[PDB]
C-alpha cells in the first residue's frame, strides 16, 4: 500500500543520491579507468562475476525465510527470480553463464573458476549474515539486490564496452538489452507489517552499504598490482 510504496520510493532515492558505487561517473573503478590496464580492469570482472552466481543461492535463502513466515506470495516471486536467473526465459542458459560465456568469447577473459579475492570473500561473508536474520530484513537486503540491479548493470556495460576493442559478442548484447533496454514490491506489500518497516530499511541499507564496501575494495585490490612495495 502507500506507506510501503513511500518506502521503497525512499530506499530507491537513497541509492541514487548517497552511494557513489552504483554512480556511473563516481564508481570507484570507474574513477580509476584513466590510469587502469587491460589486465586490472579484466580482474575486476572476473571478481564481479562471482557475485551474480552467489546471488541465486542468496536469493533462494531469502525465498526460504519467505515461506517460513507465512510470506507465500513472496515466496513464489522469488522462485520466480531464481528460474528466470537460471535460465527460464533465456533457454535454460543461466545469467551468469551469458555474461561468462560473453566475456570469453569476446575478451578472452575466463572467468569460470574464479576464486574470490580478499574482497569478494569478505563480501559473501557479510553477505550471508544479512540472509541469516528475520524476514523482514532479509527481504530488505533482496529488494536492495533488485534495486541495485539496473544501476549496476550500467556500470558494468561501461567496464565491458571499455575492454573491448570492437563490438562485444551478439548474446552478451542480448543479456544487456533484456535488462537495460514491481513484481517484488508488490508481494512484499501484501505481508509486511509497519511495525517492521525499519527492519526492511535496515536490511537494504546493510546490503548497499556492503556492495559498495566491495566496490571500493575491488578497486583498490585491482590498482595494487602494479604497486612497488615501498
Given at each position: 500500500g502507500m506507506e510501503f510504496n513511500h518506502l521503497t520510493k525512499q530506499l530507491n532515492q537513497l541509492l541514487a543520491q548517497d552511494y557513489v558505487?552504483?554512480?556511473?561517473?563516481?564508481?570507484?573503478?570507474?574513477?580509476?579507468?584513466?590510469?587502469?590496464?587491460?589486465?586490472?580492469?579484466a580482474y575486476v570482472?572476473?571478481?564481479?562475476?562471482?557475485?551474480?552466481?552467489?546471488?541465486?543461492?542468496?536469493?533462494?535463502?531469502?525465498?526460504?525465510?519467505?515461506?517460513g513466515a507465512g510470506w507465500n506470495g513472496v515466496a513464489q516471486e522469488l522462485q520466480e527470480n531464481i528460474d528466470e536467473e537460471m535460465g527460464s526465459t533465456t533457454g535454460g542458459?543461466?545469467?551468469?553463464?551469458?555474461?561468462?560465456?560473453?566475456?570469453?568469447?569476446?575478451?578472452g577473459v575466463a572467468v569460470k573458476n574464479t576464486m574470490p579475492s580478499v574482497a569478494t570473500s569478505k563480501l559473501l561473508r557479510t553477505v550471508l549474515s544479512l540472509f541469516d536474520r528475520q524476514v523482514d530484513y532479509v527481504l530488505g537486503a533482496t529488494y536492495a539486490i533488485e534495486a541495485t540491479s539496473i544501476p549496476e548493470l550500467t556500470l558494468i556495460v561501461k567496464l565491458v564496452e571499455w575492454?573491448?576493442?570492437?563490438?562485444?559478442?551478439?548474446?552478451?548484447?542480448?543479456?544487456?538489452?533484456?535488462?537495460?533496454d514491481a513484481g517484488l514490491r508488490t508481494s512484499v506489500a501484501a505481508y509486511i507489517q509497519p511495525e517492521e518497516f525499519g527492519e526492511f530499511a535496515a536490511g537494504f541499507?546493510?546490503?548497499?552499504?556492503?556492495?559498495?564496501?566491495?566496490?571500493?575494495?575491488?578497486?583498490?585490490?585491482?590498482i595494487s598490482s602494479e604497486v612497488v612495495l615501498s
Open positions: 558505487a552504483f554512480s556511473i561517473t563516481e564508481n570507484p573503478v570507474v574513477q580509476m579507468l584513466s590510469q587502469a590496464s587491460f589486465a586490472q580492469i570482472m572476473q571478481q564481479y562475476s562471482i557475485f551474480p552466481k552467489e546471488l541465486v543461492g542468496f536469493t533462494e535463502l531469502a525465498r526460504r525465510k519467505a515461506l542458459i543461466s545469467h551468469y553463464t551469458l555474461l561468462a560465456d560473453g566475456l570469453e568469447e569476446g575478451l575492454l573491448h576493442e570492437g563490438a562485444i559478442p551478439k548474446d552478451l548484447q542480448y543479456f544487456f538489452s533484456k535488462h537495460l541499507r546493510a546490503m548497499i552499504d556492503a556492495m559498495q564496501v566491495w566496490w571500493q575494495e575491488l578497486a583498490q585490490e585491482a
